[PDB]
């Protein structure tokens, strides 16, 4: 008999139902987000970090470190091969 008032009732529930769950999921991660490679930490030195940076990095990612390890184990084992036989 009178005029009910829909057009300003969105205060109680934000428009949409499915994207409401994703709103909180995607709005919160943008605060603590790296602008462009912040704190890359590409430089380190712990007597083995240089080897990791030079060979164990994703830029090369080749089979050369495995061959170097094989050569090193051969060099180490030559001495005890002489010692045993």
């Amino acid at each position: 008999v009178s005029t009910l008032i829909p057009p300003k009732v969105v205060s109680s529930k934000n428009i949409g139902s499915a994207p409401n769950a994703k709103r909180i999921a995607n709005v919160v991660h943008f605060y603590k987000s790296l602008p462009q490679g912040p704190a890359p930490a590409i430089k380190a030195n712990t007597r083995l970090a240089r080897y990791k940076a030079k060979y164990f990095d994703g830029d090369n990612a080749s089979g050369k470190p495995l061959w170097h390890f094989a050569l090193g184990i051969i060099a180490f084992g030559y001495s005890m091969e002489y010692y045993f036989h």
Partner: protein
């Protein structure tokens, strides 16, 4: 797309202000029309009876 949808609440309240005001205003301003209806009916009856 949500941004585009929410862009349309920006100024709805300002217009619906006057909308909700004038809605009830005009709906209740027919009281003078209701008071004029009985006078018009009395006038119609008077003209009809003297025509009779």
């Amino acid at each position: 797309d949500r941004i585009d949808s929410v862009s349309q609440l920006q100024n709805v309240a300002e217009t619906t202000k006057v909308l909700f005001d004038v809605s009830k205003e005009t709906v209740e301003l027919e009281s003078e029309a209701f008071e004029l209806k009985q006078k018009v009916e009395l006038a119609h009856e008077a003209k009809a009876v003297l025509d009779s």
